Amino acid sequence: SFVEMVDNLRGKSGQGYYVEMTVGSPPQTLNILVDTGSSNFAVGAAPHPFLHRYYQRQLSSTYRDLRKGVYVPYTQGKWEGELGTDLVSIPHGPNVTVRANIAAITESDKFFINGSNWEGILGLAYAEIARPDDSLEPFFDSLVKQTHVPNLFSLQLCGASVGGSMIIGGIDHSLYTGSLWYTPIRREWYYEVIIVRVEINGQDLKMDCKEYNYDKSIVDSGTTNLRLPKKVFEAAVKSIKAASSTEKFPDGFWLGEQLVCWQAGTTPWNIFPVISLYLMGEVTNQSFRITILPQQYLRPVEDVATSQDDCYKFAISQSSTGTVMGAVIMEGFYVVFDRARKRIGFAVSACHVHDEFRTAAVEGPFVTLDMEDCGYN
Ligand SMILES: C[C@@H]1CCCCCCOCC(=O)N(C)[C@@H](C)C(=O)N[C@H]([C@H](O)CNC2(c3cccc(C(C)(C)C)c3)CC2)C1
């Protein structure tokens, strides 16, 4: 019965993917961003210039105040609000209703996006990173405890404005090709994984693999970019610059700030390399790789001029808090968050990015010795 959930995600490019939800009795409809990089369910609950509607606790007979404040600071953006519970449903999801924690957002800074069409965020990660503390049950834990929905979900994020699917409770085999390859969830807080090897155009970066995971590596649908630790970011940008030295880009383009444009349909895709991330496998000394095309880490944007030039932002940025496999990385792939078996699955998506001579891939098995040493302690 997963077909009812296919194509239940929408979004604008760089602005996240949302699913339609209802809160309260009678049901109030809100668009909620799906974020595997946090664990708080939160909705606008007060007027905001960029909100087109919001949760009105005053109108829900099933609302219950928790008499406790809450605030969440992200890498970029933050909000504060009042905690409570209410009944929640997913119209294009399973046919159930859960009593869930809801943070009613009353103040926010650089969080809501101008003309974005979503009004809240659904944090799909584990209680350990919930605010104010791990005793606030995240939505998906409530869904699993209160219903018969199996303890996993999968995300198929499709590129450019954007759409996709969130399959709640299972795997839809018509959304991917090939085999699913699984990597262990190292720890149930973020969706933390271990990267064991990195290659650019087939060339190993040849760094101590601990650097790739310093201080952690996570899968985060709520972060747009691929974010790399400083040492890894410098090696990759050095390598991507060299592969595309045919052409010249402002140094502010490599910092994510400036666009680059080309006369429409002449984007020189061939001079940007592919990036291969190797992930810890399920059996001893075994890994698999995902290959990222340049169509994934060059994000399309709007021409500042009156031209029809294709314009792009560099969507690899530097991090001081570990590797983040963001939406840019997930777009090629069908991604299974198998919480019940503590693993994450990757396969080539049915809506996969298309190059003329290259293709995004999920390939295994690979042999990788000493994968355990790649985890950071
Ligand atoms: C704020 C956003 C939700 C709204 C914006 C969605 C699309 C906009 O896209 C721009 C973009 O890429 N943004 C805004 C990144 C830079 C970011 O900050 N994204 C967030 C993620 O939750 C961040 N997740 C991490 C994180 C960082 C810091 C704290 C925490 C808590 C405390 C919640 C555990 C979690 C794990 C990386 C969601």
From Swiss-Prot:
Induction: Up-regulated by the Ca(2+)-regulated transcription factor NFATC4.
Alphabetical keyword list: Acetylation, Aspartyl protease, Cell membrane, Cell projection, Cytoplasmic vesicle, Disulfide bond, Endoplasmic reticulum, Endosome, Glycoprotein, Golgi apparatus, Hydrolase, Isopeptide bond, Lipoprotein, Lysosome, Membrane, Palmitate, Phosphoprotein, Protease, Signal, Transmembrane, Transmembrane helix, Ubl conjugation, Zymogen
Keyword set includes Lipoprotein: yes
GO cellular component, one term: early endosome
Primary localization: membrane
Reaction(s) the record says it catalyses: Broad endopeptidase specificity. Cleaves Glu-Val-Asn-Leu-|-Asp-Ala-Glu-Phe in the Swedish variant of Alzheimer's amyloid precursor protein
Membrane topology (UniProt): Single-pass type I membrane protein
Activity regulation description: Inhibited by RTN3 and RTN4.
GO MF annotation terms: amyloid-beta binding; aspartic-type endopeptidase activity; beta-aspartyl-peptidase activity; endopeptidase activity; enzyme binding; peptidase activity; protein serine/threonine kinase binding
Effect caused by changing D35N: Decreases beta-cleaved soluble APP production
Tissue spec. comment: Expressed at high levels in the brain and pancreas. In the brain, expression is highest in the substantia nigra, locus coruleus and medulla oblongata.
GO terms of biological process kind: amyloid fibril formation; amyloid precursor protein catabolic process; amyloid-beta formation; amyloid-beta metabolic process; cellular response to amyloid-beta; cellular response to copper ion; cellular response to manganese ion; detection of mechanical stimulus involved in sensory perception of pain
Subcellular location: Cell membrane; Golgi apparatus, trans-Golgi network; Endoplasmic reticulum; Endosome
Enzyme Commission number(s): 3.4.23.46
Domain Peptidase A1: 17-347
Residues glycosylated per entry: N95, N114, N285
Subunit organization: Monomer. Interacts with RTN1; RTN2; RTN3 and RTN4; the interaction leads to inhibition of amyloid precursor protein processing. Interacts with SNX6. Interacts with PCSK9. Interacts with NAT8 and NAT8B. Interacts with BIN1. Interacts (via extracellular domain) with ADAM10 (via extracellular domain). Interacts with SORL1; this interaction may affect binding with APP and hence reduce APP cleavage. Interacts with NRDC AND NRG1.
Protein function: Responsible for the proteolytic processing of the amyloid precursor protein (APP). Cleaves at the N-terminus of the A-beta peptide sequence, between residues 671 and 672 of APP, leads to the generation and extracellular release of beta-cleaved soluble APP, and a corresponding cell-associated C-terminal fragment which is later released by gamma-secretase. Cleaves CHL1.
Name this polypeptide is given: Beta-secretase 1
Native species: Homo sapiens (Human)
